[PDB]
Design an enzyme around this catalytic site. Structure first.
Site, PDB file in Angstrom:
ATOM      1  N   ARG A  38       0.825  -1.205   0.000  1.00  0.00           N
ATOM      2  CA  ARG A  38       0.000   0.000   0.000  1.00  0.00           C
ATOM      3  C   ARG A  38       0.863   1.261   0.000  1.00  0.00           C
ATOM      4  NH1 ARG A  38      -2.855   2.607   4.925  1.00  0.00           N
ATOM      5  NH2 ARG A  38      -4.031   4.257   3.865  1.00  0.00           N
ATOM      6  N   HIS A  42       0.399   3.927  -2.949  1.00  0.00           N
ATOM      7  CA  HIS A  42      -0.016   5.319  -2.718  1.00  0.00           C
ATOM      8  C   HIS A  42       1.074   6.319  -3.067  1.00  0.00           C
ATOM      9  CE1 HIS A  42      -3.852   4.893  -0.116  1.00  0.00           C
ATOM     10  NE2 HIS A  42      -3.811   3.993  -1.086  1.00  0.00           N
ATOM     11  N   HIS A 163      -5.347  -6.602  -3.542  1.00  0.00           N
ATOM     12  CA  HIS A 163      -6.163  -6.827  -2.348  1.00  0.00           C
ATOM     13  C   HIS A 163      -6.167  -8.280  -1.900  1.00  0.00           C
ATOM     14  CE1 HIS A 163      -8.442  -2.805  -3.024  1.00  0.00           C
ATOM     15  NE2 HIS A 163      -7.285  -2.654  -2.403  1.00  0.00           N
ATOM     16  N   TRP A 179     -10.006  -8.941   2.408  1.00  0.00           N
ATOM     17  CA  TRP A 179     -10.624  -9.447   1.196  1.00  0.00           C
ATOM     18  C   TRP A 179     -10.487 -10.947   1.059  1.00  0.00           C
ATOM     19  CZ3 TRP A 179      -7.708  -5.026   1.489  1.00  0.00           C
ATOM     20  CH2 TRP A 179      -8.316  -3.843   1.063  1.00  0.00           C
ATOM     21  N   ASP A 208     -14.339  -2.716  -5.695  1.00  0.00           N
ATOM     22  CA  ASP A 208     -14.123  -4.108  -6.070  1.00  0.00           C
ATOM     23  C   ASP A 208     -15.320  -4.635  -6.856  1.00  0.00           C
ATOM     24  OD1 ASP A 208     -11.617  -4.344  -4.472  1.00  0.00           O
ATOM     25  OD2 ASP A 208     -12.917  -4.468  -2.711  1.00  0.00           O
TER      26      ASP A 208
HETATM   27  C1  HEM Z   1      -8.667   0.025  -7.392  1.00  0.00           C
HETATM   28  C2  HEM Z   1      -8.837   1.038  -6.534  1.00  0.00           C
HETATM   29  C3  HEM Z   1      -8.411   0.897  -5.069  1.00  0.00           C
HETATM   30  C4  HEM Z   1      -9.123   1.315  -4.012  1.00  0.00           C
HETATM   31  C5  HEM Z   1     -10.500   1.994  -4.011  1.00  0.00           C
HETATM   32  C6  HEM Z   1      -8.415   0.968  -2.815  1.00  0.00           C
HETATM   33  C7  HEM Z   1      -8.856   1.196  -1.530  1.00  0.00           C
HETATM   34  C8  HEM Z   1      -8.271   0.670  -0.409  1.00  0.00           C
HETATM   35  C9  HEM Z   1      -8.721   0.851   0.952  1.00  0.00           C
HETATM   36  C10 HEM Z   1      -9.970   1.663   1.348  1.00  0.00           C
HETATM   37  C11 HEM Z   1      -7.874   0.190   1.757  1.00  0.00           C
HETATM   38  C12 HEM Z   1      -7.927   0.060   3.291  1.00  0.00           C
HETATM   39  C13 HEM Z   1      -6.883   0.912   4.021  1.00  0.00           C
HETATM   40  C14 HEM Z   1      -6.998   0.642   5.504  1.00  0.00           C
HETATM   41  O1  HEM Z   1      -8.095   0.871   6.070  1.00  0.00           O
HETATM   42  O2  HEM Z   1      -6.014   0.150   6.111  1.00  0.00           O
HETATM   43  C15 HEM Z   1      -6.860  -0.436   0.944  1.00  0.00           C
HETATM   44  C16 HEM Z   1      -5.839  -1.222   1.420  1.00  0.00           C
HETATM   45  C17 HEM Z   1      -4.904  -1.882   0.637  1.00  0.00           C
HETATM   46  N1  HEM Z   1      -4.672  -1.642  -0.713  1.00  0.00           N
HETATM   47 FE1  HEM Z   1      -6.132  -0.889  -1.983  1.00  0.00          FE
HETATM   48  N2  HEM Z   1      -7.245   0.330  -3.194  1.00  0.00           N
HETATM   49  C18 HEM Z   1      -7.204   0.287  -4.576  1.00  0.00           C
HETATM   50  C19 HEM Z   1      -6.148  -0.185  -5.331  1.00  0.00           C
HETATM   51  C20 HEM Z   1      -5.028  -0.825  -4.857  1.00  0.00           C
HETATM   52  C21 HEM Z   1      -3.870  -1.172  -5.630  1.00  0.00           C
HETATM   53  C22 HEM Z   1      -3.696  -0.810  -7.104  1.00  0.00           C
HETATM   54  C23 HEM Z   1      -3.023  -1.820  -4.815  1.00  0.00           C
HETATM   55  C24 HEM Z   1      -1.648  -2.431  -5.101  1.00  0.00           C
HETATM   56  C25 HEM Z   1      -1.403  -3.069  -6.244  1.00  0.00           C
HETATM   57  C26 HEM Z   1      -3.624  -1.890  -3.508  1.00  0.00           C
HETATM   58  C27 HEM Z   1      -3.099  -2.517  -2.394  1.00  0.00           C
HETATM   59  C28 HEM Z   1      -3.653  -2.481  -1.129  1.00  0.00           C
HETATM   60  C29 HEM Z   1      -3.249  -3.279   0.014  1.00  0.00           C
HETATM   61  C30 HEM Z   1      -2.154  -4.360  -0.085  1.00  0.00           C
HETATM   62  C31 HEM Z   1      -3.991  -2.929   1.073  1.00  0.00           C
HETATM   63  C32 HEM Z   1      -3.961  -3.509   2.511  1.00  0.00           C
HETATM   64  C33 HEM Z   1      -3.064  -2.692   3.426  1.00  0.00           C
HETATM   65  C34 HEM Z   1      -2.876  -3.243   4.810  1.00  0.00           C
HETATM   66  O3  HEM Z   1      -3.266  -4.389   5.118  1.00  0.00           O
HETATM   67  O4  HEM Z   1      -2.305  -2.490   5.645  1.00  0.00           O
HETATM   68  N3  HEM Z   1      -4.849  -1.242  -3.550  1.00  0.00           N
HETATM   69  N4  HEM Z   1      -7.115  -0.103  -0.385  1.00  0.00           N
END
Ligand code: HEM
Ligand SMILES: O=C1O[C@@H]2[C@@H](O)CO[C@]2(O)C1(O)O
Ligand code: NA
Length: 250
Positions: A38, A42, A163, A179, A208
């Site tokens: 993440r 970001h 995810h 997820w 999603d």
């Molecule tokens: C497609 C649009 C996307 C949206 C709307 C989105 C949204 C989110 C949200 C709301 C979270 C939760 C953050 C939290 O509460 O800790 C999250 C976590 C995360 N995102 Fe996504 N994301 C997107 C795309 C991506 C992409 C492109 C990647 C990497 C290739 C990614 C990797 C991750 C990972 C690995 C987490 C988990 C982080 C953790 O466990 O600390 N996301 N994302």
């Protein structure tokens, strides 16, 4: 041929390899690969091709970017990595955080993403608000990944498979839950869970679910749910592109 990568010194390349090894050990030992993925996403996903602002240029170290609402919790990741960074002063933060993302995917069993050094640390963070909104749908995803970042629909669906790692936290995004049943394993399970519908103990965001109803995204969800090798190939290509937005363009 869209890229022309810069020449860096042998010492720079040696530091990349030594930092990679330290990152592999730390990320595995502290079980923080999802947070580090993440962090890298970001960092990179703020690029806007029209102004060539944002992107993977180290600005997640800047407290003003860490204060963006979308970046809640990434201050933890920055601080966890700083002891390693202090051992590698030659490296840019830009390179270092993208390397952490590549390592996060590796240590959780995902594909080997190429890594090319030489990103500069830029002084100004992007404006807040570039990253995708979890409550919006396919038009929004195409605006953010397509019109801002310059990525394809295939890239959108493959990158959403990230995810397979980690979870949402009520104090960070406000959503809550993982997820997949294996949040430290990089596989194609995200797409399988999407196709099976909602189920107790697991989360799906509106963004999603937008992949299921869109006529171009849905065949890719089907493909990746059935064929992990195809997912890994397309994920590798998309993550490489993401990690290099605005960097080394020919
Ligand atoms: C497609 C649009 C996307 C949206 C709307 C989105 C949204 C989110 C949200 C709301 C979270 C939760 C953050 C939290 O509460 O800790 C999250 C976590 C995360 N995102 Fe996504 N994301 C997107 C795309 C991506 C992409 C492109 C990647 C990497 C290739 C990614 C990797 C991750 C990972 C690995 C987490 C988990 C982080 C953790 O466990 O600390 N996301 N994302
Ligand atoms: O990857 C992650 O690292 C944190 C660690 O505390 C365990 O789970 C986390 O909260 C996370 O999902 O953000
Ligand atoms: Na998983």
């Amino acid at each position: 041929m869209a890229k022309s990568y810069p020449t860096v010194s042998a010492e720079y390349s040696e530091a990349v390899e030594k930092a990679r090894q330290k990152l592999r050990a730390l990320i595995a030992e502290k079980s923080c690969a999802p947070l580090m993925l993440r962090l890298a996403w970001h960092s990179a996903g703020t690029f806007d091709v029209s102004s060539r602002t944002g992107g993977p240029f180290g600005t997640m170290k800047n407290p003003a970017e860490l204060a963006h609402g979308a970046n809640a919790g990434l201050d933890i990741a920055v601080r966890l990595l700083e002891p390693i960074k202090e051992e590698f002063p030659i490296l840019s933060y830009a390179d270092f955080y993208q390397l952490a993302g590549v390592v996060a995917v590796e240590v959780t069993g995902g594909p080997q993403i190429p890594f090319h050094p030489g990103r500069e640390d830029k002084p100004q963070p992007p404006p807040e608000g570039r990253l995708p909104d979890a409550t919006k749908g396919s038009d929004h995803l195409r605006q953010v990944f397509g019109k801002q970042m310059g990525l394809s629909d295939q890239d959108i669906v493959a990158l959403s498979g990230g995810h397979t790692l980690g979870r949402c936290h009520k104090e960070r995004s406000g959503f809550e839950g993982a997820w997949t049943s294996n949040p430290l394993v990089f596989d194609n399970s995200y797409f399988k869970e999407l196709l099976s519908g909602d189920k107790e103990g697991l989360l799906q965001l509106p963004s999603d679910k937008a992949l299921l109803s869109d006529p171009a995204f849905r065949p890719l969800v089907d493909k990746y749910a059935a064929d992990e090798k195809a997912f890994f190939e397309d994920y590798k290509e998309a993550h490489l592109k993401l990690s290099e937005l605005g960097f080394a363009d020919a």
